[PDB]
Structures are given as structure tokens and as C-alpha cells.
Design a protein around this ligand. Sequence first.
Ligand SMILES: [Gd]
Ligand SMILES: [Gd]
Ligand SMILES: [Gd]
Lengths: 241, 241
Amino acid sequence: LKISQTKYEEILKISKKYIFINQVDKSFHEAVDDLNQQDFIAVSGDGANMGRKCKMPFLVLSTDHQIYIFDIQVMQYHAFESGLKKILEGDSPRKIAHDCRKLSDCLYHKHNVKLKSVFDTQVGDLIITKNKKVTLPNKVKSLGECLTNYLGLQQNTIDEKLDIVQSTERPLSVKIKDSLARNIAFLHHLSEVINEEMQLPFYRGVECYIENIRSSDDFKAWELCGKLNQIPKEFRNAIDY
Amino acid sequence: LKISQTKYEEILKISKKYIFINQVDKSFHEAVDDLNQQDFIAVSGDGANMGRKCKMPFLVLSTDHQIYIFDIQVMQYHAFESGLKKILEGDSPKKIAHDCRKLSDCLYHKHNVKLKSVFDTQVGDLIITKNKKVTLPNKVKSLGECLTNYLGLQQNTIDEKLDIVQSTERPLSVKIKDSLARNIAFLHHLSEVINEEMQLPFYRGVECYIENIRSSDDFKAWELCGKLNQIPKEFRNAIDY
Ligand SMILES: [Gd]
Ligand SMILES: [Gd]
Ligand SMILES: [Gd]
């Protein structure tokens, strides 16, 4: 694990505590209001794996503290008109996704929802790789490959083959709901790690600031307190790469 | 304004709804628990403007939704031993600051708190500027300048010269509390804007993903659904500058 044991356990608990929503009722509106209080929500690709060829049977969204499964098959367009569309189309919250290409296609052509304002962790991995290796790799990384690489999770964490027929059977099984929740549970976290890893020069510049006065002897420190309109002398080399 | 009118009004409300804490009591523990639920908290530089030369009379911390003013002059080290130290020295939450140089100095030498894990918006404006202009500027930007530049706020938003004598008199005046709260109110939002503006290639790569399949005709779209281990054909061009 590259995440803490504490944080891992907290996410595992979140994975078990999902809320399933299959009517536009008070729990729906409470979910929509919680999603709208966040800077970032995560959206799973589960349910959109055929792009524009098929409607989504469900839509999995989370905050950093709570996972929601919306039963799109049963609520139909009502779930979108009652708040999900504005969430997905709006600037805020930003949507975290891992490879939103098919999600975007499915939402637009099957649900009339134009996804906008996304943090894509697959794109982030490509940016981190380019920053390090100068050129892009020839292939992209799966969500599970990223969860292993960035968080240290075991290789089998994501259930990648949900069965298309069971996903459309109702009542929706507990086994499928539990898989959907586990498959989204680490995505919020992944995004925070990838965002930091994208910004290595920035973070070196921060570390220069945090130390610049604090580590100096008194006379030096007092001289620097009078020169705060200036960049620290070691800053340019710090952020260099 | 470069922020929405709605968001502006939300932040001005937060600025008025601060909580003042001057004893290690139930409100204090409530605040520490709230701050520890967050990915990011902000920390104002107000109170630390002489670095190591003087103790902080107050410490102002905020979440995205709530401002807290802690009376360090009255609580003294109890406030740090009761939860503030671990917050400020821990990896999580990350602390947003604008120019943490003196804050870091004061916290360590006057309060035995080693600030760690910071997102510094002054550093972030430097990174943005270097990205755009190739080289670093010859001066740094104040918090007020960055608020105007990035959020569109008016020039006099920050009260940059708190009255030293009223800052150490108790009861702490409403005028000083109100200033302290106004001076931190916009810092969380500033950090979110600066974080996005640091990452322009990333965001163009994201827009490439959102459009790649969605904008294609059906034939192309379906071919692309069979080639998701590959990078979109225009992605390099998108992320190039
Ligand atoms: Gd988080
Ligand atoms: Gd309370
Ligand atoms: Gd925010």
C-alpha cells in the first residue's frame, strides 16, 4: 500500500455504506444536494461500456465520503431531469472519471447529457508519464492498473466483467451493487494522488517556501522577512527539472 | 468577477459566519473534527507577520464551508496540543496558504509546530507565470493581487495592516474578527482556481477524451470502442503547447 492503513480502511468502509436510489424521492434529493456541495464527485464507467449503443442501467456517483447508485433503468429520464443532468453538465462539481470516453458517448447519445468539467485519472497518468519519460507511452493504463501503481492496491481490486444480462435484471442483485460500489470507492482518492503527482515542480517550490525563513539563523531570517516581495534565491533551481 | 455571482455570494456569507474559539471546549473539538474531515484547509498569514519574532495572537483556519478563528493568545499551547499541531504537521489535510514563508517561521520557533503539506497559492501563481512567460517574474504577487487577477475581485478586498495593538487586546474586537474572516474567505476558492490553471495540457487532454468518441460518427465511434487501450489519435496534439 502507498496509502495509509487508516485511509485504506476508511475507503473500504465507504465501499460498504453505499446508498441505492431507485425513485425520485427524498433520498434522491438528499443525494443530489450532497453531490452539489462538493468540489469533486466521482463517476464510474460502469454501465456505459457499450457507449452510444445502449442506455446505462445504473449510474454510480460518489463524494469523497459517500457512494450513490442510481437506478437509471427504473427512473429513466426523470433521474436526469430531477438533478443528475445539471450535475453532469455543470462546471461544478468537477467529475472524476477514469477514461471517460465511453461514458461521454453514452450519456450524450442515449441520455441527452453533455458531460463537462472532468478530471480524468487516465489522462493524468499519461501526463505524469510524459513529464517523466519525455514522450507518451504507447498504451493507456486501466483503473485497476492505476490503483496498483499509485495507491499500492492489489491487482484484482476492480471487477471488470460485470455481466450485461444480470445488470438489467431487477431486483438489482446485492452482488452487483456491492461490485459497483467497490469499483468506484478508490476513485476519489486516486484523483487526489494523481493531481499531486502531476505538479512536482510546484511542490518543490512549496518546500523551498516552507523552509526559506524557518531554517535560517536569526539574522538571515530577519533579512528575509524584509524581502518578501522577492522570490527566494533558491526557488528557480528548486522548481527546475 | 471571474467567479460566478452565486459563488461570490456563497463566499461572502461564509465570511460573515465565522466561528471564534477561545477555549478548548466542545466548539474547539467540533472544529478540529471538521478540519480533519477535509482534504484541504486554509491557513491565513494573519498573526504571523513578524515570523519568529512574535507569537501569534490568533490563528485563522478554514474549510471550504466554514471559517474558524482560534485565540492562541488565550489558549496558548493547549490549542496546539489539543489538535491543532497534528493538523498543521500532518500530511492530511493539506494546508492552503498564500506565501507561507513567515507563517512557517512563526509556527515553528514560537509555537513548536513544524508546518508540512502545503498548497501555496503564491508559488502556484509563479508556476502559472513561468509556464506562460518561460521565465519567472521579478516579484511575487500579494494575496489581494491574486484574488483580483484570478477571481476578478476588487483591489481592496484584503485588510493588509491589522492594528497590532487591537490584535493583542481582549476581548478581541468584532472589527478585527470580521477582517480576519474576510481575509481568509476567498483563499480556498483561490487554490482551486490556481490548481486548475497550473494544468493546461492536462485539461486539453481531458477535453480530447470527452470528445473523442462522443463527437464521432457511428462507425468511427464503434471502432474506437474496440481500441480503448490506445491513446486517441489527436491527444498528442491536444496536450502540446
Ligand atoms: Gd480525499
Ligand atoms: Gd455545536
Ligand atoms: Gd470550493
